[PDB]
Amino acid sequence: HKSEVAHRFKDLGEENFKALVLIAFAQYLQQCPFEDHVKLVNEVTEFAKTCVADESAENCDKSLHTLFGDKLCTVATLRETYGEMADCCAKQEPERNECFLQHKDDNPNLPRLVRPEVDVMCTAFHDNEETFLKKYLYEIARRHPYFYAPELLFFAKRYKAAFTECCQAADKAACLLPKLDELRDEGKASSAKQRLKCASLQKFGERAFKAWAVARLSQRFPKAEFAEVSKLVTDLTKVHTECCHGDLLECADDRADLAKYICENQDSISSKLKECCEKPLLEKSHCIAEVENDEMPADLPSLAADFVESKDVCKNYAEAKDVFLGMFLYEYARRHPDYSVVLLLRLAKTYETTLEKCCAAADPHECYAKVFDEFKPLVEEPQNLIKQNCELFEQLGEYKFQNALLVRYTKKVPQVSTPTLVEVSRNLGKVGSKCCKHPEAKRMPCAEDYLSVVLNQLCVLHEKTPVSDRVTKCCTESLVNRRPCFSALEVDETYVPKEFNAETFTFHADICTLSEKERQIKKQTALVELVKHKPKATKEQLKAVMDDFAAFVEKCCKADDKETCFAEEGKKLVAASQAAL
Ligand SMILES: CCCCCCCCCCCCCCCC(=O)O
Ligand SMILES: CCCCCCCCCCCCCCCC(=O)O
Ligand SMILES: CCCCCCCCCCCCCCCC(=O)O
Ligand SMILES: CCCCCCCCCCCCCCCC(=O)O
């Protein structure tokens, strides 16, 4: 097109356009005040309309990167506020855009965003909807300069829906707060998935990611032929690499192109893409990436004929090893939408090892004969862990389950700080609440999806302040052995018990007025501290102390003159508990 500004403006619409321009500037000029970004947006938008009325008007022929860089270099305080970044303005466009990219601050020093009171939010939202929503969109964007813009917009619209609905309800807070919590959770989850997947693309190279994409794309598109899944894997690897580099426009064009291709070849790929492919370009790739798995073909043979009994397995494997393993993965994954991607990768890995050991042995066709028998245990491992853990979650509530995990992982890595054990145990509990309500046929993908974020959050924390050599080993391992590495952690039989500190086990009547959430975190904190002090306590002993404590709390929150109850009965509870252990 003669005018990229005009074409993007027509295709996106005025509203999406303004929001995206705001996110972009917010991500590059992370320290300018909101009203500055508003003025930049309005100026750019006005220019855009000029180009929509006539693509030949001056400057409309310029590229997007040139116009963006020009507006950046129009900020008069650029050198005072950003220093080096102002030097990018001396370069010509190919180098200028890259320089700006590099000078994005992934960790700016900005005060933590305070969630105001529900009445304050609803009042501002009603009295000034667009400034209320846009200011927050800027506050979020400036704190995630590498978060993909369009997805941030997709979140923003869900925030708008949350306020439009809840600020009319009688119990506003009961409506909104859970929704704001969900949005926050998905936001940090996604924002960490991005960083994780790029760090894997850099650490382990294109091949491993290609493997992953074969598995997931095959579960999603079982009716597609291998050549098509392979074409999509190559294009998807390109998209991810480019998006991990950072350029918004390049990444967007790559995703839009892939979406166009997938929508023109629906019959070759999937039958559940009908509506996604009718959505506007802004939502297309997003919709296609979230679509449910396609129904798998009914009359699918077993893999025995192609990958075991057939002669030429070694010939077809040495001919193009990665293509062959890709074919094995493809056939296996499209047959098992129930398996996790990582599990399929342990299968493909195992099959690769044995094909390596057997095609060089006396008789290959006999060495690799009973290979699929090797898959069974690797498959039953996550299955048994799911059955047992969801079975435990059905017995105990979410909270008591959290306490079970708390005791197990505290005994496993007692060197981890207390608040981190509490937060990991509670998060794992939430994963149990969410996935255990699916049937078995759909539980393992769920767990993986959630575990990858939880075990990810742990690892970043552990990187900043390392404590356990075993946890470091699990965090530096390949993303396929990460979860198994954590499951392999054993109780630390070398840990020296922590010194008894009376205050750690002293309780005051304020606990009676705390919210259920803060009361829970207080008791769970004391429970971790209790296991760290008496790490060798047995399940029954621990239950006895916890029972004593629970009854003690309900007695002192029910008594006249509560503080003396907590101090007296507190002394008795502690003495008795030390004696029992
Ligand atoms: C369409 C071809 C894609 C290439 C497929 C290669 C399959 C390799 C299978 C081994 C598992 C790969 C998992 C990554 C970890 C590793 O490097 O070992
Ligand atoms: C003068 C222009 C400055 C910058 C303009 C804002 C950039 C807008 C381009 C982003 C459009 C995203 C297209 C859809 C994304 C996707 O399908 O993946
Ligand atoms: C990064 C996605 C951009 C749009 C192209 C994807 C459309 C094909 C659907 C396959 C998506 C599978 C799940 C996400 C893949 C990924 O980004 O790693
Ligand atoms: C920063 C250090 C964090 C260390 C946290 C220690 C607790 C590890 C949590 C392990 C969860 C993985 C669950 C896999 C299934 C299993 O329980 O075996």
XYZ file of C-alpha atoms and ligand atoms in Angstrom:
653
model
C 0.000 0.000 0.000
C 1.034 3.582 -0.693
C 0.181 4.625 2.908
C 0.840 2.168 5.725
C -0.753 4.605 8.200
C -3.927 4.818 6.140
C -4.130 1.069 5.530
C -3.661 0.265 9.230
C -6.183 2.936 10.167
C -8.806 1.586 7.773
C -8.196 -2.014 8.802
C -8.142 -1.417 12.570
C -10.654 1.396 13.002
C -10.204 4.642 14.877
C -10.669 3.143 18.360
C -8.339 0.158 18.069
C -5.853 2.430 16.288
C -5.779 5.009 19.082
C -5.453 2.332 21.748
C -2.565 0.650 19.931
C -0.724 3.928 19.311
C -1.089 4.634 23.025
C 0.266 1.216 24.022
C 3.218 1.634 21.641
C 4.270 5.049 22.903
C 3.627 3.917 26.480
C 6.063 1.055 25.918
C 8.838 3.229 24.472
C 8.410 6.428 26.531
C 7.852 4.628 29.805
C 8.565 7.739 31.908
C 6.533 10.438 30.283
C 3.251 11.576 31.862
C -0.005 10.236 30.483
C -1.127 13.577 29.021
C 1.973 13.583 26.817
C 1.050 10.222 25.323
C -2.494 11.465 24.821
C -1.152 14.389 22.797
C 1.116 12.136 20.724
C -1.799 9.796 20.030
C -4.139 12.587 18.958
C -1.447 14.024 16.683
C -0.692 10.673 15.040
C -4.408 9.917 14.687
C -5.034 13.260 13.021
C -2.179 12.562 10.644
C -3.658 9.126 9.928
C -7.035 10.623 8.980
C -5.203 13.017 6.693
C -3.709 9.986 4.957
C -7.054 8.140 4.839
C -8.549 11.057 2.908
C -5.602 11.107 0.467
C -2.721 8.607 0.497
C -0.656 11.104 -1.547
C -0.596 13.897 1.051
C 2.894 14.698 2.306
C 4.541 12.123 4.596
C 1.779 9.531 4.029
C 4.171 7.499 1.867
C 6.554 7.103 4.814
C 6.807 3.753 6.538
C 5.394 3.068 9.979
C 8.822 2.765 11.584
C 9.909 6.115 10.160
C 6.803 7.950 11.398
C 7.055 6.316 14.831
C 10.739 7.165 15.182
C 10.075 10.736 14.070
C 7.450 11.203 16.768
C 9.771 9.672 19.351
C 12.519 12.104 18.351
C 10.043 14.981 18.647
C 9.957 14.645 22.447
C 11.975 17.676 23.527
C 12.867 16.220 26.942
C 14.110 12.998 25.332
C 17.755 13.343 26.417
C 16.946 14.701 29.892
C 14.593 11.834 30.697
C 16.090 8.864 28.814
C 19.731 9.728 28.080
C 21.192 7.161 25.673
C 17.849 6.647 23.942
C 18.085 10.181 22.569
C 21.240 9.068 20.715
C 19.152 6.671 18.597
C 17.804 9.792 16.895
C 21.137 10.374 15.143
C 20.852 7.097 13.185
C 18.922 6.402 9.988
C 15.787 4.354 10.175
C 16.945 0.696 9.975
C 19.366 1.312 12.853
C 17.144 3.839 14.627
C 14.253 1.451 15.185
C 16.593 -1.292 16.423
C 18.313 1.148 18.792
C 14.965 2.194 20.244
C 14.125 -1.497 20.630
C 17.284 -2.186 22.613
C 16.766 0.766 24.946
C 13.424 -0.531 26.235
C 13.663 -0.945 30.019
C 12.233 -4.365 30.919
C 12.328 -3.470 34.652
C 11.493 0.201 35.177
C 11.394 1.560 38.711
C 7.750 2.481 39.000
C 5.670 2.331 42.195
C 3.430 -0.716 42.450
C -0.008 -0.037 40.943
C -2.534 0.377 43.747
C -5.989 -1.049 43.083
C -8.269 1.750 44.373
C -11.532 1.181 46.233
C -14.459 -0.229 44.264
C -16.488 2.957 44.781
C -13.586 5.098 43.562
C -13.093 2.956 40.455
C -16.790 2.884 39.577
C -17.122 6.619 40.161
C -14.161 7.495 37.934
C -15.283 4.971 35.306
C -18.774 6.487 35.199
C -17.697 10.152 35.285
C -14.939 9.748 32.694
C -14.882 6.339 31.024
C -12.183 6.813 28.397
C -9.652 8.660 30.553
C -10.231 6.115 33.329
C -9.673 3.153 31.008
C -6.888 4.712 28.903
C -4.877 5.914 31.898
C -4.881 2.389 33.317
C -4.048 0.954 29.900
C -1.021 3.263 29.902
C -0.060 2.354 33.483
C -0.090 -1.296 32.426
C 1.638 -0.762 29.072
C 4.531 1.260 30.525
C 5.224 -1.582 32.974
C 5.356 -4.204 30.178
C 7.308 -2.674 27.282
C 7.714 -6.183 25.777
C 4.121 -7.348 26.247
C 2.463 -7.869 22.864
C 0.255 -4.817 22.222
C -2.855 -6.444 20.697
C -3.158 -8.927 23.553
C -2.949 -6.041 26.005
C -5.852 -4.507 24.094
C -7.749 -7.794 24.369
C -7.285 -7.570 28.144
C -8.377 -3.922 28.208
C -11.715 -4.719 26.568
C -12.361 -7.399 29.211
C -11.662 -4.802 31.894
C -14.182 -2.501 30.205
C -16.743 -5.298 30.309
C -16.002 -5.955 33.977
C -16.706 -2.348 34.924
C -19.722 -1.893 32.651
C -21.317 -4.919 34.326
C -20.233 -4.652 37.952
C -20.603 -0.900 38.480
C -24.380 -1.323 38.034
C -24.666 -4.197 40.541
C -25.872 -3.762 44.112
C -22.848 -5.553 45.594
C -20.309 -4.016 43.230
C -17.237 -5.388 45.034
C -18.557 -8.964 45.090
C -18.942 -8.688 41.311
C -15.772 -6.810 40.378
C -13.050 -7.995 42.761
C -13.184 -11.640 41.554
C -13.064 -10.430 37.936
C -10.139 -8.081 38.579
C -8.402 -10.994 40.296
C -8.985 -13.282 37.311
C -7.669 -10.644 34.900
C -4.586 -10.013 37.042
C -3.892 -13.751 37.177
C -4.196 -14.314 33.430
C -2.138 -11.180 32.857
C 0.891 -12.265 34.869
C 0.503 -15.845 33.632
C 0.578 -14.790 29.965
C 3.279 -12.168 30.514
C 5.443 -14.902 32.030
C 4.629 -17.498 29.347
C 6.009 -15.056 26.770
C 9.347 -14.534 28.560
C 9.610 -18.274 29.229
C 9.018 -19.365 25.642
C 11.543 -16.862 24.319
C 14.187 -17.930 26.845
C 13.616 -21.503 25.632
C 13.916 -20.473 21.995
C 17.301 -18.951 22.856
C 18.564 -21.612 25.257
C 17.611 -24.814 23.403
C 17.349 -23.641 19.791
C 14.751 -23.918 17.066
C 14.621 -27.727 16.958
C 13.136 -28.291 20.425
C 10.530 -25.596 19.835
C 9.739 -27.223 16.478
C 9.148 -30.488 18.336
C 6.783 -28.722 20.720
C 4.847 -27.101 17.879
C 4.468 -30.422 16.068
C 2.912 -31.958 19.163
C 0.536 -29.085 20.000
C -0.462 -28.361 16.380
C -1.143 -32.051 15.903
C -3.443 -32.279 18.901
C -5.187 -29.158 17.638
C -5.510 -30.149 13.942
C -5.749 -33.961 13.828
C -7.411 -34.102 10.372
C -4.534 -32.248 8.686
C -1.847 -34.132 6.779
C 1.737 -34.084 7.982
C 2.973 -31.823 5.171
C 0.462 -29.195 6.349
C 1.337 -29.512 10.037
C 4.996 -29.200 9.006
C 4.343 -26.093 6.917
C 2.520 -24.554 9.898
C 5.355 -25.513 12.251
C 7.945 -23.756 10.104
C 5.807 -20.625 9.774
C 4.978 -20.685 13.501
C 8.664 -20.969 14.413
C 9.368 -17.937 12.244
C 6.526 -16.022 13.927
C 7.807 -16.847 17.382
C 11.360 -16.006 16.651
C 10.379 -12.632 15.189
C 8.014 -11.852 18.075
C 10.753 -12.763 20.567
C 12.961 -10.196 18.863
C 10.469 -7.468 19.797
C 9.381 -5.461 16.737
C 5.628 -4.935 17.052
C 4.930 -4.451 13.326
C 7.014 -7.395 12.107
C 5.461 -9.704 14.712
C 1.967 -8.486 13.864
C 2.443 -8.967 10.123
C 3.820 -12.460 10.715
C 0.824 -13.482 12.834
C -1.645 -11.849 10.426
C -0.047 -13.655 7.475
C -0.186 -17.007 9.237
C -3.830 -16.402 10.173
C -4.686 -15.535 6.560
C -3.062 -18.743 5.371
C -4.822 -20.885 7.970
C -8.168 -19.313 7.050
C -7.757 -19.837 3.319
C -6.899 -23.521 3.888
C -9.523 -24.398 6.502
C -10.526 -27.618 4.716
C -6.871 -28.712 4.883
C -6.541 -27.975 8.624
C -9.632 -27.771 10.833
C -13.419 -27.425 10.769
C -13.708 -25.455 14.035
C -12.105 -22.309 12.559
C -15.268 -21.099 10.823
C -16.094 -18.229 13.180
C -12.494 -17.313 14.029
C -11.860 -16.733 10.323
C -14.797 -14.318 10.096
C -13.447 -12.117 12.919
C -11.615 -8.891 12.009
C -7.887 -8.976 11.357
C -7.057 -7.626 14.822
C -8.662 -10.635 16.522
C -7.869 -13.328 13.926
C -4.586 -14.893 15.073
C -5.737 -14.520 18.696
C -8.971 -16.425 17.977
C -7.182 -19.140 15.999
C -4.679 -19.693 18.820
C -7.432 -20.190 21.437
C -9.727 -22.468 19.412
C -10.650 -25.867 20.827
C -8.964 -28.989 19.459
C -10.566 -30.374 16.309
C -12.289 -33.750 16.491
C -9.828 -36.454 15.537
C -10.578 -38.816 12.621
C -12.321 -41.986 13.756
C -10.637 -44.759 11.762
C -7.030 -44.139 12.747
C -4.727 -47.193 12.827
C -2.128 -47.901 15.455
C 1.405 -46.635 14.926
C 2.776 -50.200 14.855
C 2.720 -50.557 11.064
C 4.725 -47.408 10.242
C 7.137 -47.090 13.187
C 7.759 -50.659 14.441
C 6.919 -53.595 12.185
C 7.786 -51.954 8.867
C 11.181 -52.582 7.407
C 12.960 -49.437 6.191
C 12.358 -47.807 9.600
C 16.108 -47.332 9.900
C 16.301 -46.278 6.249
C 13.406 -43.821 6.542
C 14.928 -42.579 9.813
C 18.518 -42.026 8.622
C 17.113 -40.476 5.452
C 15.777 -37.526 7.487
C 15.857 -38.146 11.241
C 14.048 -35.009 12.382
C 11.384 -35.400 9.692
C 10.787 -38.988 10.803
C 10.583 -38.140 14.508
C 8.279 -35.313 13.519
C 6.059 -37.875 11.798
C 6.035 -40.116 14.887
C 5.167 -37.157 17.111
C 2.468 -36.057 14.653
C 0.774 -39.472 14.513
C 1.008 -39.896 18.301
C -0.177 -36.407 19.276
C -3.180 -36.247 16.981
C -4.267 -39.530 18.584
C -3.814 -38.256 22.147
C -5.283 -34.816 22.769
C -5.389 -36.072 26.377
C -1.608 -36.219 26.849
C 0.450 -33.181 27.771
C 2.794 -31.779 25.137
C 5.791 -32.547 27.346
C 4.676 -36.161 27.750
C 4.505 -36.602 23.979
C 8.009 -35.136 23.853
C 9.263 -37.748 26.338
C 7.748 -40.380 24.063
C 9.321 -38.923 20.910
C 12.609 -38.584 22.788
C 12.492 -42.198 23.980
C 11.651 -43.466 20.500
C 14.570 -41.378 19.200
C 17.016 -42.888 21.700
C 16.027 -46.451 20.919
C 16.077 -45.853 17.154
C 19.604 -44.565 17.756
C 20.687 -47.643 19.732
C 18.949 -50.242 17.529
C 19.633 -49.124 13.956
C 23.319 -49.765 14.755
C 22.784 -53.178 16.407
C 22.997 -56.724 15.038
C 19.347 -56.832 13.911
C 17.512 -53.478 14.064
C 14.039 -54.908 13.378
C 14.386 -57.085 16.494
C 16.085 -54.546 18.772
C 13.345 -51.905 18.469
C 10.509 -54.460 18.353
C 9.019 -53.897 21.824
C 9.655 -50.145 21.978
C 6.088 -48.978 22.632
C 6.232 -50.983 25.864
C 8.691 -48.325 27.026
C 6.032 -45.616 26.651
C 3.601 -47.103 29.177
C 5.356 -46.107 32.450
C 6.153 -42.589 31.229
C 2.444 -42.262 30.392
C 1.187 -43.642 33.712
C 3.445 -41.339 35.760
C 1.529 -38.052 35.232
C -1.730 -40.010 35.098
C -1.271 -41.590 38.524
C -0.066 -38.264 39.945
C -3.225 -36.585 38.637
C -5.601 -39.296 39.891
C -4.044 -39.409 43.359
C -3.783 -35.617 43.723
C -7.334 -34.862 42.537
C -8.571 -37.717 44.728
C -6.868 -36.031 47.687
C -8.346 -32.679 46.652
C -11.858 -34.169 46.645
C -11.442 -35.429 50.223
C -9.988 -32.262 51.756
C -11.268 -28.833 50.853
C -9.135 -26.516 48.742
C -7.729 -25.051 51.969
C -6.889 -28.304 53.777
C -5.405 -29.601 50.513
C -3.245 -26.490 50.396
C -2.111 -27.392 53.915
C -1.200 -30.923 52.806
C 0.905 -29.596 49.921
C 2.328 -27.042 52.358
C 3.607 -29.771 54.678
C 4.964 -31.879 51.822
C 6.896 -29.144 50.027
C 8.114 -27.593 53.280
C 9.585 -30.962 54.235
C 11.000 -31.231 50.698
C 12.755 -27.839 50.506
C 12.786 -26.279 54.013
C 15.393 -23.687 52.975
C 12.770 -21.779 50.941
C 11.425 -18.656 52.648
C 8.093 -19.047 54.407
C 5.967 -16.646 52.297
C 7.150 -18.403 49.133
C 6.178 -21.840 50.445
C 2.770 -20.405 51.370
C 2.231 -18.793 47.966
C 3.374 -21.843 45.979
C 1.225 -24.184 48.084
C -1.847 -21.979 47.670
C -1.297 -21.582 43.909
C -0.901 -25.361 43.544
C -4.150 -25.627 45.467
C -5.872 -23.368 42.945
C -4.538 -25.570 40.139
C -6.202 -28.476 41.911
C -9.496 -26.590 42.105
C -9.392 -25.719 38.406
C -8.144 -28.881 36.688
C -9.673 -31.574 38.915
C -13.148 -30.485 37.770
C -12.330 -31.625 34.222
C -12.706 -35.293 33.230
C -9.590 -37.427 32.979
C -9.532 -37.122 29.179
C -8.735 -33.399 29.591
C -6.877 -33.156 32.920
C -3.197 -33.554 31.937
C -3.117 -30.665 29.423
C -4.733 -28.460 32.061
C -2.204 -29.329 34.772
C 0.747 -28.804 32.441
C -0.649 -25.460 31.334
C -1.021 -24.294 34.930
C 2.049 -25.993 36.338
C 4.255 -24.394 33.704
C 3.291 -21.005 35.087
C 3.578 -21.902 38.776
C 6.867 -23.757 38.416
C 7.938 -20.827 36.261
C 7.160 -18.197 38.883
C 9.133 -20.246 41.413
C 12.158 -20.461 39.166
C 12.480 -16.734 38.531
C 12.232 -16.150 42.286
C 14.815 -18.837 42.925
C 17.107 -17.265 40.337
C 17.049 -13.910 42.127
C 17.754 -15.448 45.556
C 18.890 -19.071 45.160
C 18.546 -21.376 48.141
C 18.489 -25.002 46.957
C 20.931 -26.723 44.604
C 18.225 -29.239 43.726
C 15.721 -26.488 42.883
C 18.341 -24.741 40.767
C 18.870 -28.050 38.974
C 15.130 -28.270 38.270
C 14.962 -24.660 37.052
C 17.946 -24.926 34.690
C 16.767 -28.259 33.262
C 14.967 -28.636 29.947
C 11.307 -27.620 30.026
C 10.432 -31.290 29.363
C 12.081 -32.527 32.585
C 11.182 -29.477 34.695
C 7.990 -30.853 36.221
C 9.396 -34.406 36.656
C 12.500 -32.897 38.285
C 10.302 -31.191 40.877
C 8.227 -34.356 41.390
C 11.525 -36.178 42.076
C 12.350 -33.961 45.062
C 12.668 -35.949 48.281
C 12.420 -34.886 51.902
C 15.582 -33.097 53.057
C 16.793 -35.531 55.736
C 19.837 -33.305 56.406
C 17.920 -30.142 57.386
C 18.665 -28.938 60.922
C 15.455 -27.848 62.681
C 14.932 -24.131 63.101
C 15.167 -22.473 66.505
C 11.926 -22.106 68.402
C 10.874 -18.452 68.428
C 7.987 -17.709 70.769
C 6.664 -14.751 68.771
C 6.370 -16.884 65.637
C 3.728 -18.878 67.563
C 2.061 -16.063 69.541
C -1.401 -15.056 68.346
C -3.551 -12.006 69.069
C -7.266 -11.273 68.868
C -6.881 -9.250 65.661
C -6.902 -12.611 63.867
C -10.603 -12.878 64.751
C -11.397 -9.831 62.575
C -9.167 -10.706 59.611
C -10.696 -11.773 56.319
C -10.909 -15.482 55.551
C -8.019 -15.041 53.101
C -5.669 -13.294 55.532
C -6.669 -15.585 58.404
C -5.830 -18.516 56.117
C -2.423 -17.114 55.148
C -1.672 -16.428 58.828
C -2.473 -19.980 59.915
C -0.648 -21.455 56.910
C 2.380 -19.295 57.713
C 2.401 -20.642 61.266
C 2.044 -24.150 59.797
C 5.154 -23.771 57.641
C 7.071 -22.303 60.588
C 5.868 -25.267 62.647
C 7.156 -27.774 60.121
C 10.485 -25.911 59.893
C 10.833 -26.034 63.681
C 9.759 -29.693 64.030
C 10.534 -31.105 60.570
C 10.363 -34.710 61.787
C 6.814 -34.425 63.129
C 4.503 -37.144 61.836
C 1.223 -36.649 59.997
C -0.774 -37.684 63.070
C 1.201 -35.425 65.408
C 0.785 -32.501 63.004
C -2.961 -33.143 62.810
C -3.123 -33.196 66.609
C -1.382 -29.827 66.919
C -3.461 -28.273 64.128
C -6.670 -29.571 65.742
C -5.578 -28.097 69.077
C -4.818 -24.767 67.360
C -8.098 -24.594 65.424
C -10.123 -25.318 68.550
C -8.016 -22.764 70.448
C -8.793 -20.067 67.874
C -12.528 -20.767 67.888
C -12.450 -20.641 71.695
C -10.597 -17.324 71.936
C -12.608 -15.655 69.158
C -15.774 -16.626 71.055
C -14.786 -15.511 74.572
C -15.410 -12.338 76.488
C -12.042 -10.530 76.910
C -10.369 -12.134 73.940
C -6.816 -10.877 74.235
C -6.300 -12.550 77.616
C -7.697 -15.757 76.136
C -5.125 -15.620 73.340
C -2.292 -14.997 75.804
C -3.295 -17.575 78.464
C -4.663 -20.305 76.216
C -1.825 -19.359 73.880
C 0.740 -20.211 76.543
C -1.051 -23.507 77.221
C -1.309 -24.424 73.530
C 2.380 -23.755 72.907
C 3.617 -25.606 76.007
C 1.400 -28.608 75.276
C 2.433 -28.617 71.609
C 6.156 -28.514 72.402
C 5.605 -31.415 74.819
C 3.715 -33.453 72.203
C 6.516 -33.006 69.681
C 8.659 -31.081 11.220
C 10.015 -31.489 11.807
C 10.253 -30.935 13.212
C 11.465 -31.559 13.896
C 11.074 -32.658 14.875
C 12.237 -33.137 15.742
C 11.743 -34.024 16.887
C 12.791 -34.257 17.976
C 12.264 -35.197 19.063
C 13.078 -35.126 20.354
C 12.391 -34.309 21.448
C 12.781 -32.832 21.397
C 12.590 -32.101 22.726
C 13.600 -30.970 22.925
C 14.688 -31.340 23.933
C 15.956 -31.912 23.285
O 16.644 -31.199 22.498
O 16.320 -33.099 23.534
C 2.282 6.370 13.048
C 1.998 4.970 13.593
C 2.751 4.693 14.893
C 2.455 3.297 15.433
C 1.068 2.814 15.010
C 0.539 1.710 15.922
C 0.843 0.333 15.351
C -0.417 -0.379 14.883
C -0.062 -1.702 14.225
C -0.463 -2.903 15.064
C -1.589 -3.649 14.372
C -1.769 -5.063 14.900
C -2.377 -5.944 13.817
C -3.067 -7.179 14.387
C -2.110 -8.034 15.213
C -2.112 -9.516 14.833
O -2.946 -9.973 14.004
O -1.269 -10.287 15.362
C 1.797 -17.091 17.915
C 0.439 -17.310 17.253
C 0.166 -16.256 16.184
C -0.996 -16.633 15.272
C -0.683 -17.900 14.493
C -1.181 -19.122 15.245
C -2.414 -19.691 14.569
C -2.306 -21.204 14.450
C -2.826 -21.885 15.709
C -1.722 -22.599 16.481
C -1.448 -21.926 17.819
C -1.114 -22.939 18.910
C -0.912 -22.300 20.286
C 0.038 -21.095 20.285
C 1.327 -21.337 19.490
C 2.509 -20.437 19.881
O 2.459 -19.193 19.693
O 3.552 -20.935 20.380
C 12.400 -20.240 44.850
C 12.376 -21.659 45.417
C 11.012 -22.333 45.255
C 11.020 -23.784 45.736
C 9.624 -24.286 46.096
C 9.645 -25.693 46.687
C 8.353 -26.440 46.380
C 8.382 -27.053 44.985
C 6.988 -27.208 44.390
C 6.907 -28.440 43.501
C 5.640 -28.462 42.658
C 5.734 -29.495 41.544
C 4.663 -30.567 41.671
C 4.959 -31.795 40.813
C 4.186 -33.018 41.304
C 4.704 -33.501 42.658
O 4.320 -32.941 43.726
O 5.527 -34.457 42.694
